[PDB]
Amino acid sequence: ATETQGEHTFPVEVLISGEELRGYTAGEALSAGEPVYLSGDYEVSASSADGGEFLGVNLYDVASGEPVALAGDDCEVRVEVSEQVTANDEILPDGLGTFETVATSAASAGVAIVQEGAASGEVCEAYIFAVQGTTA
Amino acid sequence: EQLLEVVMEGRELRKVAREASNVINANTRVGDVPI
Amino acid sequence: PDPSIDEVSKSDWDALTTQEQDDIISQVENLSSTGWVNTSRERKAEAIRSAIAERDTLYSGNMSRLPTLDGDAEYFTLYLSAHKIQLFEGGEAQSESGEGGSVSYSTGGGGEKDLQKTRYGRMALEYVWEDNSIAALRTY
């Protein structure tokens, strides 16, 4: 996720507010702003689509096996979306390193609420409010 | 009132790596040694 | 009733239609199992008019910024009306006796003041802080 200032492009700063920042081992290479889920004991990997796989968003780029910092629920974040989102949309991982709306997905409930809208392929601002694991 | 002001220690592990290896005090968290 | 007893002042009561007054009278008559059926309409009307007047003058305004009529203004005015009708019939019957048997009621050593002197009055009294004097003011 990147911001343009005329000539220049800058890295988007993933975190806006919140202190619920937690440490894990990366199960694979990951990028700032990617949604992730538990793939092993204290190990996180990129979320697939349609729920049951979300612990937080990765805060900075990591290679496989590196320690990684993650923003959980109670955090307010800048994240890239797969589609147009509007204020009050619930969103969750699209399986493509980015978020989509609950309304578009096969899931019934999301993990973050959109606070500032965005176009497709663009950065929204969202508050993370839930985690999703394996329920069977 | 009188009382034992003591705590008995747990198991303590042997610490050697600072002596038993070459130690680099790095200026940066990430870096390179050329070979 | 369509205009409620708490929505009318003394001048409004005089302006109501006979039916609007009769609706409020009918509501007041529900507060006794006998309905005071042997007391005439004019007397029930006078009791309600008087209860409205007395509410607006004696049981109105504020007391440490709390409303002095703390309970429901509808039921307060109805109980105050019922209290008056019962006093127009001579007061509480403490005991009644005749060919059909005898009964004595637990009225007991009721206090000196008018609202203490009937069951409807004692009900109305709880709506208006039990006539307690909790008013307060300060100099600025």
């Binding site: 975190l15 | 200026n27 940066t28 968290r29 | -």
Partner: protein, 49 residues
């Protein structure tokens, strides 16, 4: 304070009339403006600046 006005023509011995200064106010309501940023200790250490 109210704007500056004019004195009025007056007779001898006639009662002078009150044009006293009158006042109003402009209210203020100070809004909390805020800004923030965070740096890790590692980043604080390693930067050239």
């Amino acid at each position: 304070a109210s704007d500056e006005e004019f004195a009025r023509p007056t007779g001898q011995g006639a009662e002078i009339r009150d044009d006293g200064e009158t006042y109003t106010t402009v209210a203020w309501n100070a809004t909390k403006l805020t800004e923030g940023s965070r740096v890790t200790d590692e980043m604080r250490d390693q930067a050239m600046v």
